[PDB]
């Protein structure tokens, strides 16, 4: 059987506060009336979204409009509960009213007002500054979240809201979000093909915070280089195959004995053997002025087979690569 895991930090947090704070499917929600709003327009979120921009009637408030897709309740009061939890908290998306349709009686969100452009839109033309700014405010949202017991599982940069004119950002979508609590087995079909940590891919459940800090590399990757996504993947079974051929299948084999994982029979064949490239072969001329070795010494040590070795939050925070940024929020 599969060697257990806790995590590195923050790994006792959920124990020692009050049931009430992790225990979501005990949790009463007081449902508001969504006669309150009135949605103005649909905001382009994908297929299986329902987002829109709204007015509050009683204010003449903008606020954004989540109708939330038919789904176990569990996983409703699971994202309430988590969205109550870090509300105030930094470049956390503020939860302002949770609501009913009277006639449809079908549950809904209701947000602070933010821009509908993602940072999908916006993160393929930033100066090698601008990325290390977002990716350390993008950073304060991740350690604030595992320093109240949640870890995030869907971190894409689809998932993340950004006002580049005032320089803000909001961590949002909620719904993948779930309590961390040592020794838990997690489901593993989560977060996207792009952004999933191995992990995930060779069903290792016993995963914590650090599943986040994975994504978050795959988006760093992504930015430096200008490879969308950086590891493209057709399925589940040939992402890991793309994640292969970069950090090497020594370090993937190593990973798999050190927690004795079951390897899903189909992966035999198409692993092959691949050296841990140098990250050199991925810089070319239009990407060498977003390319530093505080960059890749960053990137390395985010995008680890072994979740345990990769940096915490706090840890990313306090590396070179941010050392301007830090002083300039000083300065400030
Ligand atoms: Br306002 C409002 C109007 C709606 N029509 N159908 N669903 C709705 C949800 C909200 Br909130
Ligand atoms: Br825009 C937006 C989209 C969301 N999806 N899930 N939560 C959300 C909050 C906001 Br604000």
Not at 134 to 144: R, S
Not at 173 to 183: K, M, N, S, V
């Amino acid at each position: 059987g599969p060697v257990p895991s806790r995590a590195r930090v923050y790994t006792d947090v959920n124990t020692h506060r009050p049931r009430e704070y992790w225990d979501y499917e005990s949790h009463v929600v007081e449902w508001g009336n969504q006669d309150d709003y009135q949605l103005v327009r649909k905001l382009g979120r994908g297929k299986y979204s329902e987002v829109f921009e709204a007015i509050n009637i009683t204010n003449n408030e903008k606020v954004v409009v989540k109708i939330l897709k038919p789904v176990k309740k569990k996983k409703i009061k699971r994202e309430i509960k988590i969205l109550e939890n870090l509300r105030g908290g930094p470049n956390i998306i503020t939860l302002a009213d949770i609501v009913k349709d009277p006639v449809s009686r079908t549950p809904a969100l209701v947000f602070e007002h933010v821009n509908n452009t993602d940072f999908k839109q916006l993160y393929q033309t930033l100066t090698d500054y601008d990325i290390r700014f977002y990716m350390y405010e993008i950073l304060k949202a991740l350690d604030y979240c595992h320093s109240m017991g949640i870890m995030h599982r869907d971190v894409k940069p689809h998932n993340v809201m950004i006002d580049h004119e005032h320089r803000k950002l909001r961590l949002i979508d909620w719904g993948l979000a779930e309590f961390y609590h040592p020794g838990q087995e997690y489901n593993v079909r989560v977060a996207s093909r792009y952004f999933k940590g191995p992990e995930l891919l060779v069903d290792y459940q016993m995963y914590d915070y650090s599943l986040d800090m994975w994504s978050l590399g795959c988006m760093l990757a992504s930015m430096i280089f200008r490879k969308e996504p950086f590891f493209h993947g057709h399925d589940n079974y040939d992402q890991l195959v793309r994640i292969a051929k970069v950090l090497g299948t020594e370090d993937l084999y190593d990973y798999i004995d050190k927690y004795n994982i079951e390897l899903d029979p189909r992966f035999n064949d198409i692993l092959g053997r691949h050296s841990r490239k140098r990250w050199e072969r991925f810089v070319h001329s239009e990407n060498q002025h977003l390319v530093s070795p505080e960059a890749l010494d960053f990137l390395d040590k985010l995008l680890r087979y072994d979740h345990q070795s990769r940096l915490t939050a706090r840890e990313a925070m306090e590396h070179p690569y941010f050392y301007t940024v830090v002083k300039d929020q000083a300065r400030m």
